[PDB]
Symmetry: D2
Subunit: 116 residues, 4 copies
């Protein structure tokens, strides 16, 4: 699994469940091409977005749809989404975890990058 | 100042100085139109981006060029930039402060919306 | 102000007002002696805790009573308080800003150490 | 496993490996009694601190020894340690994960609390 997303909820002290995630790749024409999408599980994790073969070098944008998440819980949050934009695999294949911690007016994100 | 940006460096425990910031507004055709830009000051702040008259309700994107900041310190960072995307509301007089805390593989952003 | 505390609320996107803050210094016998205290202002800030003369090198603990803050908003929070424990250095003129960002089950704290 | 600690490094984009963790419980006399300790693994995780039987209701302090961690990497950090103080199990037994994200002048911590 070369690209995984994990999301926690700082209001409830829980995984952030059923958070939509859309991944885009920058195309040769400098537009954002849809690449993969999914939703976090009961554990707040989203696995299976892509494969090592498909996850080539490029600039990727991971959009975490935080507004849609908070609105269901009856919170009107600040952000439209949390965006994570990064160059991937430019020194060979790596495994990436994007971790995010959500509050209605704040989010914190990091990356864990490992060499398989 | 209806819109202020503040950037901190979590490695050095300092303001993040001379960081480029670009602000865009979402146009009717779902593209991002340039709206305002600047560089953070010695205090890590960027004031005077816009005015109450120009800053109408809409979706805005604040792009903070964190990659250039880290590279200038000899650090290969993770992100291309930090992006903060939000709808401005009237409603909630008035002032938006977008704060960002930067690490090489991390950032956190918070909005302080006050009167 | 060699020592300032700033507290933000990540649920409301606001300063955290009327938050009690206690500062302690580590005594020679490894106990924490009261040093300074106050409540955050309407801007979420607490100034005037100490003076350059009194704030010597040493280990300090800043205790932020986050539990009372959340309970007053009807929220059962996780932490008893937020604690920030650090050595003050001379060296690095001079000013310490301890910032804290509060959520019910989370907090983040950052130090801005400037001249 | 009713008490687990997970720690990430925001400078290196990795788990925070070999971070010492000391847990204390507030005693009847309002002093902090040593309760459990250990170090994070290669995955940044610390399991096996306590048992459900031993982890009774109380106020617990989890001290994450961040200074000792950064100094080895030749960084002189700001904090002595990151402290997490919380009441546990006061509505029955729960499982607690304390997650922390470390930078030299900043740390971010949350709790994931689940009901077994
Ligand atoms: O490897 C393992 O065995 C386990 O590692 C965990 O991964 C982690 C580790 C740390 C964090 C974390 O620390 C935060 C976080 C905290 C504070 C912030 O400000 C931002 C993010 C988010 O999720 C995480 C997720 C993950 O939950 C499991 O799937 C995996 O099996
Ligand atoms: O006195 C000044 O000139 C100005 O200081 C600013 O204070 C601060 C100081 C520190 C932070 C900070 O550090 C964070 C933050 C962000 C992400 C985190 O994960 C943790 C903290 C948020 O905004 C801040 C805001 C404040 O916004 C202004 O009102 C004030 O006039």
């Amino acid at each position: 699994c070369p690209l995984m997303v994990k999301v926690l909820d700082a209001v409830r002290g829980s995984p952030a469940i059923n958070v939509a995630v859309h991944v885009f790749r920058k195309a040769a024409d400098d537009t954002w091409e849809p690449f993969a999408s999914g939703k976090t599980s009961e554990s707040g994790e989203l696995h299976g977005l892509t494969t090592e073969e498909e996850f080539v070098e490029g600039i990727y944008k991971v959009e975490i749809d935080t507004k849609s998440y908070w609105k269901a819980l009856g919170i009107s949050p600040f952000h439209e989404h949390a965006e994570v934009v990064f160059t991937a695999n430019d020194s060979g294949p790596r495994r990436y975890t994007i971790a995010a911690l959500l509050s209605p007016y704040s989010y914190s994100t990091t990356a864990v990058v490992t060499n398989p």
